[PDB]
């Protein structure tokens, strides 16, 4: 209950018996952090049957949004003020029988920037510790050609032409 | 069978062929050539004559910067995958990050202080 | 008691044969502590036959040896590591069995 | 309307991320290719400029009358274990063949 | 020519005795190896009673039967249950 974005809930039995019809039931297994007893799909299950009752009622109705037959099954949480009035609250996506909460485009980016820059700052502090300075010496860490080489290069090319490389 | 008597039976290890590498979609690989006559020269290759390039100093700094770069790259990849509708979405579920505390002020203060 | 110690140690060693649990422990930082390497060194008593007689899942022992190389624990923090090791394990297992079976059957059918 | 503006802000953010990534890459590559001769003034000259400019720019962009980012949500559509040569090109080599592991991981 | 032939013979001898030494190494492992057969049968039945020693007849890429104690067996497993 600390952070709903950072929780994942699963169950093996329901995994092989999973189909477009049963996705809501899997979310409904109860003891699932994402879903709640307060939702009306749960009130309906207490009563008999389920049909256009989510439109007659207008409240918390978890409904499947998009579905790929094998694994992908996205669920959306809506709050209805009246029939033909829908307000989207959140989205919980199920990949490989593993339920996650869809991250906000911005909470994800905030955490991401924080981790990267924290790493950069640790690296910077460590680098600053080692650098040592003196005005005479300059900087240090805490851890040419005699120009007679043109004739040597001429001799090198001469022996190249004389003794060819046979790689 | 009515009271089997176990005797000292010695068995030799069944190491006739080893599967050094196992590929996907079948395709077994028997890399082990079971040789020694050439293994002496193979070990002579290891012998000297005179973990990345050097990598004894600044290893921590190098790894830290690499990790920061990797996180940056992952975020960029996700942003480029949102840049289009290819295997992705962007539906704005009218929500509201409600913080039930005075977290902001305290956090700001402590952060600035440290 | 010593019985509970034996049972918990057996369960832990049999659980170590899981790459997911190994990646769990590596990410959570349990391997970096110098106490866990000594615990692993103590856990080597399972190599004896009298102790190996009670091991239901034998795939752990070999894995345990790798954990002593001190380079296996520095790596494996990645999830791709667990991916690859479980891939190779299940591949060896299933391919060995079913490939022996299929090779025998196919050769017997083709030679006829 | 706001969707057009939202997309514009998203593209600006993409640009910023790309620039920062490039900078970091060049920096570490240069460290590995220089090793010696590198001195504290130059190392400080590079770390500070890259990080400060890119980070300040990103925060500035995030807080200039841009769409509310907590509103929108990202939920995967299709996953196919098929080889893809276009996502490998588009993400510059990482994250190929959108499999099942990649959506919980990213 | 004699020297060359001698060197070839030496190489042959080397490979042969190296293989003989490998056989000797097997024999040294084998000597300590001798044990009760019934015990071998019981251990084989133990490791083979489940899906560990042999892949199951119908085991495709997608099975709860894993080479490790899954996660539900771990959840009831003494290990963390008693550590809690």
């Amino acid at each position: 209950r600390d952070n709903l974005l950072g929780i994942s809930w699963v169950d093996s039995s329901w995994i092989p018996i999973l189909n477009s019809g049963s996705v809501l039931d899997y979310f409904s297994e109860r003891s699932n952090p994402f879903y709640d007893r307060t939702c009306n799909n749960e009130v309906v299950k207490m009563q008999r049957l389920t049909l256009e009752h989510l439109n007659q009622m207008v409240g918390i109705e978890y409904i499947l949004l998009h579905a790929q037959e094998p694994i992908l099954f996205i669920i959306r949480k809506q709050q209805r003020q009246s029939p033909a009035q829908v307000i989207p609250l959140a989205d919980y996506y199920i990949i490989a029988g593993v339920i996650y909460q869809a991250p906000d485009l911005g909470s994800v980016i905030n955490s991401r920037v924080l981790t990267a820059v924290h790493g950069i700052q640790s690296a910077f502090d460590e680098a600053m510790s080692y650098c040592r300075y003196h005005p005479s010496k300059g900087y240090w860490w805490h851890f040419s050609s005699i120009f007679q080489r043109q004739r040597v290069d001429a001799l090198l090319l001469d022996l190249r032409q004389k003794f060819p490389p046979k790689f | 069978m009515s009271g089997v008597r176990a005797v000292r039976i010695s068995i030799e290890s069944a190491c006739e062929k080893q599967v050094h590498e196992v590929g996907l979609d079948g395709t077994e690989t028997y890399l082990p050539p079971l040789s020694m006559s050439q293994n002496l020269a193979r070990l002579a290759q290891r012998i000297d004559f005179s973990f990345q390039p050097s990598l004894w100093p600044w290893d921590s700094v190098r790894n830290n910067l690499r990790s920061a770069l990797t996180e940056m790259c992952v975020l960029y990849d996700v942003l480029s995958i949102v840049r289009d509708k290819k295997f992705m979405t962007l539906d704005p579920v009218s929500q509201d990050a409600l913080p039930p505390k005075q977290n902001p002020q305290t956090l700001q203060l402590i952060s600035k202080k440290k | 008691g010593n019985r509970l110690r034996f049972q918990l140690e057996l369960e832990f060693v049999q659980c170590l044969a899981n790459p997911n649990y190994l990646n769990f422990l590596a990410q959570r930082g349990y391997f970096k502590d110098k106490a866990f390497v000594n615990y692993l060194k103590y856990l080597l008593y399972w190599k004896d036959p009298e102790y190996a007689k009670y091991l239901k899942y034998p795939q752990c022992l070999h894995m345990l040896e790798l954990l002593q190389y001190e380079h296996f624990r520095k790596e494996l923090v990645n999830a791709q590591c667990a991916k690859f090791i479980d891939e190779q394990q299940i591949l060896h297992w299933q391919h060995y069995s079913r490939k022996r079976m299929r090779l025998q059957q196919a050769l017997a059918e083709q030679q006829q | 309307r706001e969707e057009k503006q939202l997309e514009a802000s998203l593209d600006a953010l993409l640009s910023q991320v790309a620039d920062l990534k490039n900078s970091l890459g060049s920096f570490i590559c240069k460290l590995e290719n220089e090793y010696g001769r590198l001195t504290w003034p130059s190392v400080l000259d590079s770390f500070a400029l890259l990080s400060g400019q890119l980070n300040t720019l990103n925060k500035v962009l995030k807080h200039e009358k841009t769409p509310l980012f907590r509103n929108q949500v990202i939920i995967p559509l299709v996953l196919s274990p098929d080889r893809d040569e276009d996502l490998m090109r588009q993400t510059e080599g990482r994250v190929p063949v959108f499999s099942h592991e990649v959506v919980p991981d990213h | 020519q004699l020297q060359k032939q001698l060197k070839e013979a030496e190489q042959i001898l080397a490979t042969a005795v190296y293989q003989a030494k490998e056989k000797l190494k097997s024999i040294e492992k084998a000597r300590k190896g001798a044990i009760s057969s019934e015990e071998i049968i019981k251990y084989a039945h133990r490791i083979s009673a489940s899906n560990a020693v042999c892949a199951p007849l119908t085991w495709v890429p997608g099975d709860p039967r894993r080479p490790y104690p899954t996660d539900l067996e771990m959840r009831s497993g003494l290990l963390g249950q008693m550590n809690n």
Partner: peptide, 10 residues
């Protein structure tokens, strides 16, 4: 189609 792949998809 695409069941989670313990061995890689063929």
């Amino acid at each position: 189609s695409y069941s989670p792949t313990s061995p890689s998809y063929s």
